[PDB]
From Swiss-Prot, chains A, B, C:
Keywords: Cell junction, Cell membrane, Disease variant, Disulfide bond, Endosome, G-protein coupled receptor, Glycoprotein, Host cell receptor for virus entry, Host-virus interaction, Isopeptide bond, Lysosome, Membrane, Phosphoprotein, Proteoglycan, Receptor, Sulfation, Transducer, Transmembrane, Transmembrane helix, Ubl conjugation. Residues 162-166 are annotated as: Chemokine binding, important for signaling and HIV-1 coreceptor activity. This is C-X-C chemokine receptor type 4. It comes from Homo sapiens. Expressed in numerous tissues, such as peripheral blood leukocytes, spleen, thymus, spinal cord, heart, placenta, lung, liver, skeletal muscle, kidney, pancreas, cerebellum, cerebral cortex and medulla (in microglia as well as in astrocytes), brain microvascular, coronary artery and umbilical cord endothelial cells. Isoform 1 is predominant in all tissues tested. Residues 70-73, 89-93 are annotated as: Chemokine binding. Changing residue 238 to A: Markedly reduced coreceptor activity for HIV-1 isolate LAI. GO terms for cellular component: anchoring junction; cell leading edge; cell surface; cytoplasm; cytoplasmic vesicle; early endosome; external side of plasma membrane; extracellular exosome. The gene is CXCR4. One of its GO terms (biological process) is dendritic cell chemotaxis. A motif (Important for signaling) lies at residues 109-111. Induction: (Microbial infection) May be down-regulated by Human cytomegalovirus/HHV-5. Residues 40-53, 107-130, 193-217 are cytoplasmic.
């Protein structure tokens, strides 16, 4: 009843995923380094949204440093050993959770700036300079413990596959549900609640279109979640497959893994769209 | 004579269709809930088109409530129940016909507002206030009766198929003709007669501002019919296959069924494009 | 001798060509009927290029009237008979040659309007009122004689194929080379010469006022030839196969035929891009 | 041992000639119009326009030989050894000259914004005398292997024209030279120039962040986006030929197909200079 025990990634992933990773690596390096140079070295962070997009650019730069390891592990497989596999996985997790927590924080900042426009200028300073660290980076760093523990390289079938290796499959299901939860649902629920209240409080602000700093952050968050949504659907289906709820054939269990691979490579475009909304607005 | 076998949905579709359904679910919930909040709960409807577009938002929200059942059915056939299968099909039919009848009513509103801009302020108000129910929702609720009668969960082996199971194949053909007719042809003929007589009374006149509120109607209706056209082509081809008129083999029938599934999933994006035009125009 | 077995349409190209033909049929009827209504019957043509574009709309309407027969012949085969096969092929050829000759006349009209800006107002009117018929419709109605001679319905097997049935394959080659010539090369050379001289006499002045008006015709001609270029590549390669010059495989003359089918369906969008440019003025 | 790569598929024998013909038409028309307008009607206003004139000359030179690529894609090289050498030489000249011209564009912009005061002699020196020795002399010096190793190999029935080296280590070293002096070194120079420009244009108060460094950024980004999939493919192939990427023999065929299509798609760089003169973006 074992399935196909994964299939050798289609020969085309292995030229496509390397290509996607390299495009995202180039765009991420150039764009996020330019954002850090302009908005975080020369200190022209004008709004408090540009404070959080600096945090996004730092997280995305950290991830795109390790993206060439993803490309190499796509073409060939892992050569870099165990410590660097752990480093790549914890950096991937830090980016994963920090970016979406930062987006939730930008939604909170927009909610405080629009809805509580009279009295929330002092909470908007603490939330962006002292509370952002303990609400984004500390939760993002505390969720790399499963990757400090389980992210080892398995010397296998002349493969050496760098992945999170768990004692059993229930751990995989639990941690994929945890990823889905604290990376899509709760930050997504917070963002949706903040923006629904913003739209309800802005719908009668005389009509005066306060859709300025709102449109940029709406585009940023919508593009981020559009990049990540197919991957989250794939891993939710995969987690329900592992939980013996989707008892279909092993070929479905392999096509969902292929879906996860391409949609995860395509979800790394979130590291590129923060600088893109500085090229455009 | 060769009763064919519906080959089970390509493993791909079993992850594509949930992905499309989930994208439409998120976009439709957020957009239509925000339209009902803004246009329907806060009374920011500024024209007669916005009342009909509020009706579209209500119908689309009703459908995207049941869309998660569609995604689960795309993965795991049916473990919700016969009553919930009936409710899902009834809501699907209500959306199907109410949305296109609302679009036809929008075309009548534009016809009366442009061709009869001097004596049509009461029949437009009377239309959008009282006749919209009798001409949109009563047809949508009295023509969903075949879902109350026929839509049931056949437990074919382990595949609990939730679909309309008519007594005869001719019933399937005649109801697909009914759907094609009162979902593409008659409302489509009405919408083109109302917009060809406007194009002809907007040139013989040379008008403007109204010209422009006519763009957000033309784009809405064109996008709806562009979403639904591949599905209607597919189901008309399926109906002519099922009358033993086409007879291109079982492989062609399987291809048509896959086309119908994919392009029906893609045609549900009409539930997203009503609030998208409130986000662009 | 190996006769090179001509496989039947794929099962997707039945259900795709029919979809492409239906989209183009709907768009062509609606748009070209509106153009003939407004810029034709209502005499709202005011630019001396709208006359030629009215001619395009007449040709495109004539073709999209016969497009449903193309969709039926895509799904089923020709049940309409020899005379109506001849009529459909004649209308196809008339559209084929008249549309490209009208675009050549548009380019020549812009050449006379820009290069000969002072003298050519009476030659332009003569060209658009009297010379246009004998230079577009008469050549298009004289190149359709081989359709009156050879287009026939062949009852081979159960497939009533409606196509131009020649004595030899050398006839196919010569009537594909004359198609390539009169449809891409000679009108294309005329259009390229006219627009190169236009640019050399716009860019040798502060031409900015008339570097629009020109933009619409440039977009129209470029979109037409972009639609028709893959088809012309396919049929040129097929003509060289039929000359036994390419002589590659038997799977390459079924790849070059499923290409010709797909790209000929996709080239019929030229009947839709003349009214679409009136939406994007 | 060798995978044994012998197939150009069948789509890539009709797709690639189609892509080559589209690029041949667009490149011939656009680059001829640029050379006529800029290099003959001296409408070179800027110093980007002189380098873009150099790009148009190089791209015109390559699209002259593009029909030979179209014939070699569907037929094989029946033109001769001298024509194989000439086409490969012109291909190499375009390859290196275009990217070195873009490096010169980046350096000219660097001198324009950063050293805005004391750079009008260096920017007139580079564009008038140093551009030849830094673009065309290097591009004609790295085409020496196209004079030495490019030969039509009769081999089997198909006379294949390619640059044939003694060992497979020469293929690797020349592919590495290609990657270096076509992507890395000019790309590093361009990135350094534009990063310093951004660090200087930002500080500048109200320095339109974009000015005319929009059109050059778009041109260089589009060029490198066109060439990046090809460079990923040939780097993967180069490490394959070093016996580093041992992932089978179907992977080498997949990589070679990737190289063929992504090399044809990389020739759209030969028409980005005129299309950015048709958009003025």
């Amino acid at each position: 009843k074992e399935p196909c025990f994964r299939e050798e990634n289609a020969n085309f992933n292995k030229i496509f995923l390397p290509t996607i990773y390299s495009i995202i690596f180039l765009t991420g390096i150039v764009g996020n380094g330019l954002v850090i140079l302009v908005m975080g070295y020369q200190k022209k962070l004008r709004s408090m949204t540009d404070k959080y997009r600096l945090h996004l650019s730092v997280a995305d730069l950290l991830f795109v440093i390790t993206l060439p390891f993803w490309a190499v592990d796509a073409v060939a497989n892992w050569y870099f050993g165990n410590f660097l596999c752990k480093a790549v996985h914890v950096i991937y997790t830090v980016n994963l959770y920090s970016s979406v927590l930062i987006l939730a924080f930008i939604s909170l900042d927009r909610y405080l700036a629009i809805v509580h426009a009279t009295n929330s200028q002092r909470p908007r300073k603490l939330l962006a300079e002292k509370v952002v660290y303990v609400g984004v980076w500390i939760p993002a760093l505390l969720l790399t413990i499963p990757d400090f523990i389980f992210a080892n390289v398995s010397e296998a079938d002349d493969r050496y596959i760098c992945d999170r290796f768990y004692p059993n499959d229930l751990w995989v299901v639990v941690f994929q549900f945890q990823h889905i939860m604290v990376g899509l649902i709760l930050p997504g629920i917070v963002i949706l609640s903040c923006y629904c209240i913003i739209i309800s409080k802005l719908s009668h602000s005389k009509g005066h279109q306060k859709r300025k700093a709102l449109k940029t952050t709406v585009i940023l968050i919508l593009a981020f979640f559009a990049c990540w949504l197919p991957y989250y659907i794939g891993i939710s289906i995969d987690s329900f497959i592992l939980l013996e709820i989707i008892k279909q054939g092993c070929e479905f269990e392999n096509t969902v893994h292929k879906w996860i691979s391409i949609t995860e490579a395509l979800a790394f475009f979130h590291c590129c769209l923060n600088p893109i909304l500085y090229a455009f607005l």
